[PDB]
Copies of this chain bind each other. A is one copy, B any other.
């Protein structure tokens, strides 16, 4: 049904609080973050280029958690 009859954009359409990023998918040769919305149509595809400016903090933080370092080169 979507809130309000008036057409609304995609991610960060109005300015609703970001619940939490689900993940990311390299769609069309560009990483896209699926922004989860509490009230709005939860989960929406958004280009990395647009997402970074919208909220780099949430973006950078996301990777921070799902981060993993490779084996230490030095024997």
Tell me if A's interface is mostly helix, strand, loop or mixed. helix
A24–B60 CB distance below 8 A: no
Copies in the complex: 2
With beta carbons under 8 angstroms apart, the residue of B24, B60, B67, B69 that contacts A56 is B60
CB nearest to A52 among chain B residues: B60
Report the interface size class on chain A.
Answer: 10 to 19
Q: Which residues of B contact A69 (CB under 8 A)?
A: 24-25
CB nearest to A30 among chain B residues: B64
Is the C-beta of A45 less than 8 angstroms from some C-beta in chain B? no
Contacts from A to B (Cβ < 8 Å)? 24-26, 31, 48, 52, 56-57, 59-61, 63-64, 67-69
